[model samples]
Target: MESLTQYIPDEFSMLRFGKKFAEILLKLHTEKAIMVYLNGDLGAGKTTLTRGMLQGIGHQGNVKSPTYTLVEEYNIAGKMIYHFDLYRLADPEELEFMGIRDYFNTDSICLIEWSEKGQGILPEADILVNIDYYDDARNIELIAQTNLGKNIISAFS
Candidate 1:
């Protein structure tokens, strides 16, 4: 895919990269909400990277995968951020019962894992992130799929 790729050598480095990514997002100040889709196999550190993003955005507390809860809400820097793990979703239709639309707003940011599971139910992601194993480290690719996504990518240049 057309994207920005980075090699994260370790957990610490990955966290740092994620934090910097969040900083770039913070600088964007986009008017609408932003959604990021994360694609990776098990143990790929999706939640860990999310932790760094949340931390960078001024969230203080523990960050964990919402595997069972389906979604975790965080209010930081006057913005609502929703972290979702749809791995256990038996059906995409189940999202309706949880008020999925309410989680998405003009001032919200959604970081979703296993987005494929939510297919038809979830809105299109502004940015797509794919993480893969690379020796002892991880290789991440961020692909912009919308104007906002392109803007976010351009900010990194």
Candidate 2:
């Protein structure tokens, strides 16, 4: 596995990073599923990045954290994007009850926040993105766990 790290001086730059990442995803023109696991603490800019990605993919509405709802779905260029927030999950079994498998079909893009909370039940992510606070800014790390993920990271770099 290979990892790429960068320092984001501010929120705008973080959003830019996300927008650029979204562009890469769009340009890749993948017909298969893409899973991104987002790891970060509270107020660590996870949702902000997701917001930028949603916008980059042409979503015109709001992109809020799916804290209470657990999951939020978006359709862009006919591709299904599922954003899952497992912060409040009581148990992994709840995912099966909601037919979690259906959300990860071959043609979807899934971005999961607080993935640690879904450990055993959720499928392994192709890309793992870790964001943390650094001084007054943020640091983001992208690790590719699969070939597809490595390709995406390469494209981003």
Candidate 3:
């Protein structure tokens, strides 16, 4: 039940937090294979924040949403960073067909959007991040669902 909450005034601020998160994650990657679930409505900045993390972790190219492609993989420092968008998933079994199991490993980090769409087929997330509107800005909550997640939140503050 460990968590952290922050009020982000806009997309720029969200990206800033994502960068900080990426720094912490890079530090922890030496220990835990990270999995994060992003929960939010459309246009809620999930991919925006993801872009920040990608950049923070040393990715030099433009970060595009995996909305249509399903998953986008980034290779950084010999680690695989997978950004998944399951919003368009019509069948959970499709994940199995895509060999989703192989995607989770000790040297990889997975950031998933609309993870619920792949529920029952996908493994549990180490951390669940919920983004919601608070007035004109946004309220971002980071919830740890496992020990690894707890460590992420521990370093988050």
Candidate 4:
């Protein structure tokens, strides 16, 4: 797929990537909630980026990759945040049984990994983050899929 790239400041480092990402999310804060699609390969830093977002939302604790469980929930700042990894999903149909959309209450942020695997089943994403490993570090690009995301990103520029 055709994509755009925004080089983060040269000061960007793994240490600051999450905070930076969370800052972007923090700016996008809305009572309407949001969902982010994390597109990347293994070791591409999706979980790390997620940690930053969680921290931004005031969550404190070890955050684990939901590679096996397929989904994990964290409640912070009176918001329900769900991290989903469908990489190991045996069948997309299985998602229906989980009542996936049941998780998308009024206030929440859903960040999904391996989103392409579940395709037609998942809720529409508001922001899409494509992360890739570059040499010894990471490279990430963000795309706003909704008006809320657009306004949030416009301020970053």
Candidate 5:
């Protein structure tokens, strides 16, 4: 497996790193979408990192993983970004009812949290981000499951 890791000293750095990564992704996959799985605890900075990604990509509103809605949509500079929070998802069938298939395309970004709950129905993530509390800070582990994912992490090398 191809992987890259980063030690974030604080929230500020974590946010900026997300922004940087998002820009890199857009540059590399200009005409396609990227599926990213965010793995971390509740208090972890997953959403904060996503917040930065959105802000850097031109989203002007606050970013939040919608607990009840299951997914939040954003159109940034004409690029679609769908943020999914399956933490509150009670059943995988709900995804079908929500028309999950319609949300994905070659021209969007799908940022998923608690994706494990919606497995089977959800497509495989191109990249999986494992965020953990490293003492007083945070550690970001980027694991590539696809060629595009590998290329994304390779940028950090």
Candidate 6:
């Protein structure tokens, strides 16, 4: 159970976080299901980080948090990415009817916000990226859960 960590200096700007996320994608060789667990208060840059992930896949547009919309779809360079905001999820059973299977399968990468709400509904993560709010900036930690995750971190070396 060896874990690797990296510090992303000061990701103050949304664009900077986007770039970092995109860079991380360069290490995505295999089609591993990535479940990013975002735990933070409102305006903690959770969606902003998801925006970065979309940008990593080569999406250029307003990546809004699907608070009311639930989920947003982005087809980037042939990669299917489903950005989900479950902040308003009333119950975990709600996912069973929303075609949750479509996103959690091996075809796409799921970046989930308010995953704690989904609880047992969501599948295990291949990589968990948590963003925390600091005094002056945000503290981000990317935890690799599978071999694909370890390889991605290895690319940074």
- Give the Cα lDDT of each candidate: 0.77, 0.79, 0.78, 0.66, 0.78, 0.63
Residue-pair clashes per candidate, as listed?
Answer: 0, 0, 0, 0, 0, 2
lDDT of 6 by residue, 7-107 (tens): 44455464565556555664354354656566567777666667666765567678875877777877665456777778788787776665545665555
Give the alpha carbon lDDT tens digit for every residue of 14-89 in model 5: 8789888887767654334677898888777787788878887887768764886887888765567788888778
TM-score of each model, in listed order: 0.89, 0.89, 0.88, 0.78, 0.89, 0.77
Better of 1 and 2 by lDDT: 2
Best by TM-score: 5
Worst 10 residues of 6 by lDDT: 1-10
Off by over 4 Å in 6: 1-14, 26-32
Clashing pairs in 5: none
Error of 3 at 42 (Å): 0.8
Residue 150 CA displacement from its true place in model 1, Å: 1.4
Residue 114 shift from truth in candidate 2, angstroms: 1.1
Model 6, clash count?
2
TM-score result, candidate 4: 0.78
Q: Judged by lDDT against the true structure, how good is candidate 1?
A: 0.77
Worst 10 residues of 2 by lDDT: 23-32
Q: Worst 10-residue stretch by lDDT in candidate 4?
A: 1-10
Model 5: runs farther than 4 Å from truth?
A: 30-32, 99-101
Per-residue alpha-carbon lDDT of candidate 2 for residues 23-72, written as tens digits (9 for 90 to 100): 67655444447778888887888778889788877888898668778878
RMSD of each: 2.0, 2.0, 2.1, 3.4, 2.0, 2.9
Q: Clash pairs of candidate 2?
A: none
Q: For residues 13-72, write the lDDT of model 3, one tens digit per residue.
A: 987887878767766653446878989887776777889789877878888768668878
Better of 3 and 6 by TM-score: 3
Whole-model lDDT, model 5: 0.78
